[model samples]
Target chain A: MKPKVFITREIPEVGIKMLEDEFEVEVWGDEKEIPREILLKKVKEVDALVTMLSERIDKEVFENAPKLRIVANYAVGYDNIDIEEATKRGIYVTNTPDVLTDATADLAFALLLATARHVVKGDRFVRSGEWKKRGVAWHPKWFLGYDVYGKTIGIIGLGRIGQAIAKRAKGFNMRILYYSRTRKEEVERELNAEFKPLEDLLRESDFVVLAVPLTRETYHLINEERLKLMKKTAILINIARGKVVDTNALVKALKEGWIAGAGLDVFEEEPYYNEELFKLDNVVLTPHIGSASFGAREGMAELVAKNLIAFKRGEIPPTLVNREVIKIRKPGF
Target chain B: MKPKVFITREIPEVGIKMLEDEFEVEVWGDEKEIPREILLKKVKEVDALVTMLSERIDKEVFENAPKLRIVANYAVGYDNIDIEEATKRGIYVTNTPDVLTDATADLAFALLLATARHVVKGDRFVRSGEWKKRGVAWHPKWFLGYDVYGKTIGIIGLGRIGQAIAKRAKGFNMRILYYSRTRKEEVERELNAEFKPLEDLLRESDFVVLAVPLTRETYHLINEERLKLMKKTAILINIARGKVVDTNALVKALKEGWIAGAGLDVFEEEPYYNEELFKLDNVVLTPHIGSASFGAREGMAELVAKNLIAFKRGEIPPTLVNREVIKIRKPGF
Candidate 1:
């Protein structure tokens, strides 16, 4: 019998076609998040499942999923899945990484540019009819924004995506300072990036970009005390996970002049963030679209399909997370 | 007696003080454009006049300003001034260049990034409450913008500002294609930019940036035929003068999908833009702020002051446009 595969949410057609050509592929049609009841019911029959960040995969779902041999998440961050629980049940878990680095880094750098130049505010000013209403004349003092060229950029994490952001920063003639757990001596020498402590990076940078993954240690990493260390003229950009920054502290900082502005792609309570951020002109908010580039998204989908196909063929998946499960439970069992 | 100087509009105080120390200076107190009648009346007495882009300096103004020796425009582009008339009347015309190059280039690159990542639209999306009201959780297909990294960028001009933009594009690993009236071999070698014809640049570029000055030949350079020549997915960025692109053709091309999107820092008609652009989600508009960075503007003010001071001291100004005027009239004649 063909291994039954379930895709929890809609993906690009490239991946769906790859799965349908081989296995019994089932895809959720709605753009909205799949309900928990339906997800559990569907989980029982599928041999493999491709999930999104919005889905919660825990012991309850895994306990009910009897035939599930592999769970491949269509995102770099698989924090939504209970990896420890999956490993105990001898189920393989994989995530789509490497494909999303360029897209996410593109977004982080874009946010830095937007915040520095007041791009959104400038757009709104034109659309609001204020230009014509205020006598339709150019004033020397109107809409003067901060410069991005030759400025200091402090990267919170100097991993794959952070390195990508630093590479982009180099073209702008910006000095790159990075704060990471381990110093990347090669990156420091090759890219001319300086290694600094978190506190010093925050205090010295004109633009601070966060690209670290979300974890217990990283949760609320840029909290009130840390936010206070940033320069008053500095701009904060977040393209990683939301909880890395305390949104309450961020809001207070923007309002009280602790920082100049912020550009956020993720929020602490995403889909239901602090409404107060909308009122402040200093912040630019997007609903988590760091990897939402057409090219990157399509590549991610294909990677997801490839991993699932390889696992079903009794081969080690390209990006397996729970490799320890391999000895106990063979693929295609 | 100090030769009386009249400033058409308010500029940064740095230049004002320098001029005040050298000559009996009078700056237009209002932020608005000086009335034509008052300008004509003031021109009769001032030996030198500092002009803004809003004021029209022509044969009529030259006839009225019998004492006017110099017209130092407070911008790089002096197309607003009647150069022929000023030249014929033996009045030196000067502009502030080099100082504002970095600031303008900074805005151009920022606009390109904003359009590629939907930075402005993302802001409006959050502020409009669509994400919350529509129960819009993250979707793979939502707000999928173009990727700027590792893309091909075509620059229409290769002047100081265009070279600056190419330098920034290098950081994103973008392939650079430039079309200029004359190709600089040194620029091509240094920046790894390839020189192409205007037609080829438009067709091959993923992002087309116009940095050429507005002139008779340059007006409507990107007309309907030229717009159609571009790739359907290509984006057009204009930080140069707005008349470079045909505004009417641009509106149709955007609506008809001849182009993907646009990031505009100027308008064909200032204080009065095509209202249809406000309705389009694909275009990002800003009210002419290409050189509005605080550092650059301050530098420009200082440069303007130095030029005015040098002229008053019986020395040729550093940035004199109408050099022939100097043969007929000396400083403080």
Candidate 2:
């Protein structure tokens, strides 16, 4: 008998086919998120379950899936799953990683250019009929904004994606500074990136970007005190998870002028947010669209499906997280 | 007797002082436009007049100034001046050229990024409360616009400014094409720019820019028939003279989908414009602000001052257009 797999949401057709050929594939028909109630029930009927960021897999869900051998997450971060609880059970876990470097890096670059050039502000000038009502004069003082040419940029969390962001910044004639766990040699050679202590990076850079993931040591790293260290002209771009930056602290910082402005792609507990943050012209926020590129999303879904298949075949899945099941040689799965 | 020089429209203090130091300066103290009544009366009293784009130096104005030996325009394009009438009178006419090059080039680049990225459109999304109302999904067929990276670009004028535009585009890894009065070896070698016959450039490039002056041979260069030759996905950017592009043809092109979009800096006629064109989303329009940069405006004022000083000294100005002047040798000036 073939191993059975259950997918929480509809991914790309290519990924569906990749698993269906080898296993008894059970796919959700609707692309809309599978309700938690429906998802909890589905796990009980399958040997290996595939999940995404939205569906949380904890002790309760893990205990319910008695015959389940593995849980594969379709993301680089496994924040939704309780790793300690999953490891306690005789189940293996996995997450797709390393492939999201270029796509997420593209988002950071977009945020930087979009904020520095005042792309959205210029758009509103014409869209709101403000430019038409008040014509641009030959006066130099009028409509003047900061030039991004030859400016310094600070990068937080110098991961693979952060290096790609620095490469794009190099093209803009920008001086690069990065703060990370370690200042590696390759980063300096490729991007001419200088390692700056977090405080100094904020003080010097014209634009400050945070791409750090949310971990115990890094959560709320961009709190009010750190934001205050940034220059009055500095722009903050957050493309990582919302928990990485304290939301209330950010709002107060933006309103009271801790820094010049912000561009957010994610929010703390989103689909609900500060209405006043929307009113602030200095803030340029977007719903989390970091890994949203057409090519990148397809790649993500396909990788998630492959993780599920590899684990079911009793082979070491390339992205395996939980190793206890194989170590114990449990065949209960 | 010291010759009287009429200063039209209170120019820069330095330019005005240049004339005041040598000749008797008669200024438009009101900072009000020299009305037809005031213009007619003032012209007869002065030996030379210095004016800006606002002051029209026509045949009737020339007739009023029988004592007027010279009329200098503080701008490059003399479309506002009746050069034919000035030449016939044996009166010296001069315009500030090559000065507007960098300013216009900067504006062209601003428009390219502004149009390609939809900077203005995104701004309205923030202001109009629509961004808050909407949630964007990472669905494959979402709002992704053209990125300027490695696109094929065509420049329609190979003047000093057009070459500058090409150089900026070069930074983005764009392949360039230029159409001017024959290609020079320096231009081809320095820019690695290809010489495209006029029509082929329109079809081939992702961005087709108009940087040529408006002349008899160039008027309506992009008329109804010419608009059809362009690829539907190609973007047209016009930072050149207004009359060079047929506004009706452009409007029809946008409506009928002859091309993807346009970035307009200049338009034909006075403040009144095509209200229909304003209704479109594909077009990014501005009120002819090519030379309206803060640094450029200050440079314009400074250049006009130097020209005024050169005229009073009876030596040809370095920025002299005709490179010749009428010799009206008086006691002073």
Candidate 3:
């Protein structure tokens, strides 16, 4: 019998087709996320699993999937999966990376530009017929916004995605400032990016972008105190994990005009966002679509399939997160 | 006696303050545009006039305003004025230019990125609570959009604004293709931009930006036949004049998916636009806010004041569109 592969939720057909050629694929076709009980029951018969960021692949999941050899995450961030537990259980954990860097960066900049120019608010104005009624279609003072060109942009992380954002910022003649755990010397030399302390970066930047991964250290990194340090004319953009910023604090800041505006893809809670954000025109919010570009999604699916195929053939997965798992890997396919 | 200056509409206080320093300034402080009869009567007594694009400046106004020595348009485009008529009557016409280049270009790319990434649509999705109802916040296949990075962008003009758009596109790693009346060798080398025929550029580009001036030869430039030449997946962006595009044909194209989407700032009609455009989700529309940045507006106001100051002193005004008027100029300040 072909080895069984269970996908927690529907994904692009490209990866499903690839897996079907080598395994007995069972997909959760519903639009709603698969319930925890259903996920537990389904894993009992599967040899491998393809997971989304929404899925929690913890010890309970690993214990239920006795035949599972690998869990291929369809995202770059694998925070949902307990890597240490997967490593101890001899199950390889792999993630889709590099493919999403440009897409995420594109989204970060898109949010920045959209918020800076009030694109969403402007669209609503035109659609509501207010633009005509106001008799200011081409008014010099109407719909006035901040310019993105030749301004200072502070990137909170200097990763692949942050570097991509910096490169785009360079084209607009923006000054690049960054705050990361460690300095990126090559990028600093190439993009003319300067390193600064987080407080200093926030204070000086006209736009601040968060591209850091979510961790215990990063949760609520942009709290009320940090938000206060930012310039009132500055805008903040978050394409990183939702918890990286304090959503309640952000809402208050936007309402009180502590900061100029914000563009956000992620939220403090997944699938559920603060309804208060809807009432404000200064914040532009998206439904966690940082890597939702067609090219990036397809590439991620292909990478997940490749990782599963490699592991099935007794080869190391391309993006295995727990390297030590190789020493204690499950029996041959 | 101080020469009188009349402003057809309310402008930034900075400009009014400057004019008040040297001339008696009267501003129409109403929210609505000045009526044509009111504009004619006001100009009759004023030595100089500061106008908005909404006002028409022609022979009738010249005949009525015998005391008028100059018209300093508070915008970069002077399409609203009759330049030839102004020159014949020995009246100087000056417009605010160069100052709005970056702001306008920023809006062009802002529309392009927002259209490509579905920024406005995504915001609506989250705001309307559909994203949570759909239960697919981070779904691998949900809210899929096209990437702006690594795509080909075709610029229809190579003016200062068009070049600025190209610079931003370059940072996103987009291949640059341009169509201009003449070649720009220096920009070609510096930006690695390739010159292509209009038809070819439309055919090959993933995003096509219109930045050309609206002239007799440029009117309806992207008509039905020309829009048909574009790729089905391509997006059209118009930051130029409204008449540069055929609104009816564009509405049909968008409805029929002749092109994937469009980002329009200027409509074929001022204040009033095609109602059919309101129903389409694929298009992002903004009230003519191409130069509506705080910096751009203030700079434009400053430039307008400077022009009036120069003309009041019996010196040639800066940014004079009708240089030939200098020889047949109206006598004495």
Model 1 per-residue lDDT tens digits across residues B98-137: 8888888888888887888788887777777877776756
TM-score per candidate, in order? Answer: 0.97, 0.75, 0.98
Chain A TM-score, structure 1: 0.96
Q: For model 2 chain A, give the 10-residue run with minimal summed lDDT.
A: A136-145
lDDT of 2 at B1: 21
lDDT of 1 by residue, A154-218 (tens): 99999889999999999889999999999978889988999999999999999999989888999
C-alpha lDDT values of all predictions = 0.87, 0.71, 0.89
How would you class the docking of model 1? medium
Index of the highest-DockQ prediction? 3
Candidate with better lDDT, 1 vs 3: 3
Clashing pairs in 1: none
lDDT of 3 by residue, A153-260 (tens): 999999989998999899899999999999878779999999999999999999999999888989999999999999999999999999899999999999988999
Interface RMSD of each: 1.4, 4.9, 1.4
- Candidate 1 residue-wise lDDT at B66: 90
